Symmetry: D2
Amino acid sequence: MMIRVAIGGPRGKMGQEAVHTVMNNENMELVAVLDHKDIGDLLSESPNFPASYEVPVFLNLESLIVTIKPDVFLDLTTPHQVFEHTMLCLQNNVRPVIGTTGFTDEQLQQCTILAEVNKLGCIVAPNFAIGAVLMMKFASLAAAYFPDVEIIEMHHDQKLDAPSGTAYKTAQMIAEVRPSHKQGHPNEKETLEGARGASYDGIPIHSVRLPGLIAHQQILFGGEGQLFTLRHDSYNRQSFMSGVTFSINQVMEIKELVYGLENIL
Amino acid sequence: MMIRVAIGGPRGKMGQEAVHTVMNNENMELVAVLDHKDIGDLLSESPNFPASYEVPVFLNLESLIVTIKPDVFLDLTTPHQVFEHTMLCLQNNVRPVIGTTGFTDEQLQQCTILAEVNKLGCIVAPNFAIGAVLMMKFASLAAAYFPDVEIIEMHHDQKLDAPSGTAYKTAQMIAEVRPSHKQGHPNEKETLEGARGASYDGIPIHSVRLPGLIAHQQILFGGEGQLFTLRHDSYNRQSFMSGVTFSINQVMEIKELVYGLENIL
Amino acid sequence: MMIRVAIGGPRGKMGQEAVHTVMNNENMELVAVLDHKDIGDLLSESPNFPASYEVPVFLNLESLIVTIKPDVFLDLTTPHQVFEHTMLCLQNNVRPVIGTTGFTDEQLQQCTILAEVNKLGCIVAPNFAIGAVLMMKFASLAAAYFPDVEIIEMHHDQKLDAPSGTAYKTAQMIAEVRPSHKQGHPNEKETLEGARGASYDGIPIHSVRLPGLIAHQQILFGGEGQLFTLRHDSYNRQSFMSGVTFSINQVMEIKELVYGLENIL
Amino acid sequence: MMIRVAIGGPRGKMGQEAVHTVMNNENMELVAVLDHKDIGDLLSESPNFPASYEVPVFLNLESLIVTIKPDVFLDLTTPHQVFEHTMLCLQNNVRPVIGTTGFTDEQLQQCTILAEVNKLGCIVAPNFAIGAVLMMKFASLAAAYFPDVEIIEMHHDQKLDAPSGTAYKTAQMIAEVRPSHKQGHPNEKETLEGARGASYDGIPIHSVRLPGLIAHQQILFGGEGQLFTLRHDSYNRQSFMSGVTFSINQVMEIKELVYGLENIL
Ligand SMILES: NC(=O)c1ccc[n+]([C@@H]2O[C@H](COP(=O)([O-])OP(=O)(O)OC[C@H]3O[C@@H](n4cnc5c(N)ncnc54)[C@H](OP(=O)(O)O)[C@@H]3O)[C@@H](O)[C@H]2O)c1
Ligand SMILES: NC(=O)c1ccc[n+]([C@@H]2O[C@H](COP(=O)([O-])OP(=O)(O)OC[C@H]3O[C@@H](n4cnc5c(N)ncnc54)[C@H](OP(=O)(O)O)[C@@H]3O)[C@@H](O)[C@H]2O)c1
Ligand SMILES: NC(=O)c1ccc[n+]([C@@H]2O[C@H](COP(=O)([O-])OP(=O)(O)OC[C@H]3O[C@@H](n4cnc5c(N)ncnc54)[C@H](OP(=O)(O)O)[C@@H]3O)[C@@H](O)[C@H]2O)c1
Ligand SMILES: NC(=O)c1ccc[n+]([C@@H]2O[C@H](COP(=O)([O-])OP(=O)(O)OC[C@H]3O[C@@H](n4cnc5c(N)ncnc54)[C@H](OP(=O)(O)O)[C@@H]3O)[C@@H](O)[C@H]2O)c1
Ligand SMILES: O=C(O)c1cccc(C(=O)O)n1
Ligand SMILES: O=C(O)c1cccc(C(=O)O)n1
Ligand SMILES: O=C(O)c1cccc(C(=O)O)n1
Ligand SMILES: O=C(O)c1cccc(C(=O)O)n1
């Protein structure tokens, strides 16, 4: 009755928290991890992990899957491998929960068709923090009243992808309600290239990468003589662990790909 | 077919904008104003108002009402008179739209029973700005996920009432979903009296009064390793005029008191 | 003993405030304005301006200067003409105060050499609001402690130039103290072009253009487990008028170009 | 040549970080800790601390001091004991570095006279984070331009003292430059008691206590049509450890009490 869980990227900043979270969830067993550095046969061979953590380490996902057959694979690796990892899972009977960001629209859609076809649950979560999920949800609603919006998204300066998964997802959600259009004066000029940020269906997105930050976003809706702002700030990686636990549990109940936890609160 | 509108406090910071707004609404006639300073027979006798504004001035509301019989009275006066003004209207066949803040819970409830009994529309709007209304609406929803919240509310330093009407209304709305409780360590001490702010069913409220501000609020919901924030900023009094126009129109369609525009977007 | 002042762009959002400000300064006479639309011989012929404002209108700056010989020309026009306007002034004996933004580094330096050579005062003010000036000043100082910084700069959506004059000036000031370097992970990728903003000596700058905004900036300095933020918000164009008055006065006391009011508080 | 350091409150949220920081500073030896719970003879007997941490535990400060004679005592305990602890140190030849908040003005002044008289260094640091120190420093300067200011100060909801040490110190600093006065309309009324916050020489202070927060402050200076804001956010307790290390080092160089690290950057 335990959910048998494998994790990708156990030594990472998210990885190790999720290792501990899964170790201490009483309805979940951590049955394996995937790395890409030889760090021994068992995760207990690493420092940062105690001797009790006799979890087998694999350097090859296909090997992990065939040897261990986990119910769920939680990916917290890098954008470079996210698609390949998810795909391997989805055609070898493993439910992926993907924390990792940096799918393409096309790859996400391909993953969605694979889950559909194999009747297999998958969660792609751009943010595990419940306040972030709430932010996104309210963005959809606010977009109805305020068609002009921008997104500013801020993270630690080791983050590899800009804009962030959350900002992409926010913008998609907004884009469904908001009529497509450009903002700013039609004749504005950027005299320093990049100033006005990225653009998603006309919605500007700006990305901040500084030391000290963890994960933050604000959504600014302009109106008549006023500004409505939605904001979320995660101050540490523990803010994500309830979402991770919720996602492992939730993925078992579905037979298709769910993109974003907003759908299933 | 015109809505016949009288306004209380026409020379005030809100008053004069609403005078202009009502003058330029094509489905509304400004049929009278109420002051408490002798400023002449007609509002056109005041500077700030053009010669075209031949709107009769009254210093007595009962006189105004009996002489003019407006469909609607828009009050933008002071907390000192708000109750008396609303009550006079509600038992002389006039729909009040009350911008003015500073009713007591008891007075609001008395006003609500009078409207009910006289089958007469009344809107009490703690904020006319649509982003503010949206803020309040989302506060209710957010309160379900985050029971610990505080409100910080900021206005120009001529404002007479603290906390603000909006902050009261926000807190009421939150209080319906949020279990009643105290926040902060149970043994915390205030060593400078007032630090921890006012309290509404355990919800702290803090009020900022500075030059330069117009009207602003933020709502801070604490959670695990994170903070979810809802914010609205009105940068001028024109931000309120769509709400005022919406309220005059909406009041004509109802036969009871509506508290807050959230109900009727 | 009156400062004889001419203004460029009198009907503009800044222009008209500055018209009124200069009209009501008792040590200043508004002796002319420059437009580029035929709006009559006198500014009093325009609506928005009262009959008392018998200020001659010119459509040609050289004509204005030769006819009127103002002590000072206050430019609040457009980036397209700023350089040409300043230059005409600086070689016809007129002190320019330039509110208008959008000089190039090269044009600014050319203007600085012209003022030097003609012993003629000139102020180029990227922001007239004293809190903005203070923000910039503190940015220099903060940069010593926190080498990693980003600038987010927000304005109404009729603004023509991005990034803003203030953000350029902020970055220049920072750049003098901050060692030149790139921020963000060295391998970060922008998967939506523009996300990470413009770059000034490695300092990111992001520009927000929404309805309802007037002028706003924040400066974010990342550090160990923390973030230091400097912020300024102008909520209307009156926030600039003390700076404008200060600049007209100050320009008379100098014999070279001053870039930014920080130098001369 | 090592600084011999004892710490009060080693198991606390600050305490344990400072234990690790001091253990890993190569010019410092942790020679003792003070608790008030019997947790064994050595700190290594506690979990959270490794076997290598053979640091003697004392339950009595006087005993600690006479037995160990540390150069420096770092207090991270509770407001209840702060004064007593500092005083014991200052008349038994030990330099106190006091992280703990909640001295009275009178107790602080008494401590300052004791240090003076015994020619003994003491640092009372209301914030160890360098951005906080910078915030305070800039507050003094900003106060010259903007006499109307409020302070909002936000911390986790286990914090015992409100307002915070930092907010007290900020206000003191401001109060030296700012003319003493009340803010807000002179006739404003609080209809919910506490709304307008605490008052320090007329300066309002508001205190927020929520889960998820660590330590945060903003300082809001109102002006003409504008607002200047100084802000600092500590996102974890590691943000304080450079300040702690700096303070142990700095205290050795002084022969009197220094209140706030602003003096000695
Ligand atoms: N959804 C959310 O709520 C959320 C929250 C936080 C982060 N994230 C995302 O999650 C990902 C992880 O972030 P992070 O900050 O934890 O990054 P991180 O600290 O870089 O950790 C990534 C880990 O994956 C390892 N790794 C890299 N390639 C691998 C492979 N092919 N197989 C196995 N392991 C591999 C890395 O090892 P080496 O260091 O040895 O390369 C590292 O231990 C990012 O994409 C980020 O955007 C999402
Ligand atoms: N719901 C919202 O969205 C919203 C927005 C803004 C303001 N408000 C509220 O609306 C009220 C007005 O704010 P404000 O800033 O406009 O205040 P204001 O500028 O003080 O204007 C109040 C006006 O009412 C006049 N007045 C006072 N007592 C009166 C009486 N008995 N009869 C007739 N006129 C009277 C005043 O004249 P004297 O100056 O001669 O006394 C003044 O012209 C306040 O309660 C405020 O909280 C609500
Ligand atoms: N330093 C500061 O503190 C500060 C503050 C605010 C704004 N600004 C800057 O000041 C400039 C003005 O901003 P704004 O919002 O006032 O713009 P605006 O409302 O567009 O006004 C510009 C005015 O200049 C007129 N104009 C354009 N070309 C002209 C020419 N060749 N000769 C004479 N008049 C001309 C325009 O008339 P038409 O509309 O007929 O073209 C308009 O009336 C911008 O560059 C902005 O960045 C600076
Ligand atoms: N200056 C700064 O930068 C800064 C930063 C953070 C915190 N602080 C301040 O530092 C203090 C500590 O904060 P915190 O969050 O670490 O509090 P904490 O987690 O409550 O820790 C206090 C520690 O002191 C212990 N303690 C209580 N009374 C004691 C006594 N008489 N002798 C020895 N130990 C005692 C407590 O043990 P029990 O739990 O067993 O009672 C606890 O382990 C607070 O006053 C806070 O305001 C200052
Ligand atoms: O939206 C995202 O991409 C995201 C969300 C939380 C954390 C991180 C991260 O640490 O990179 N990234
Ligand atoms: O909530 C309120 O009480 C409120 C809302 C907008 C403006 C004002 C005001 O100007 O006083 N007050
Ligand atoms: O820094 C700037 O460029 C600036 C500053 C204030 C106002 C404006 C504007 O309204 O465009 N622009
Ligand atoms: O100013 C203060 O009192 C302060 C500063 C940092 C942290 C804390 C705390 O955690 O209580 N308190």
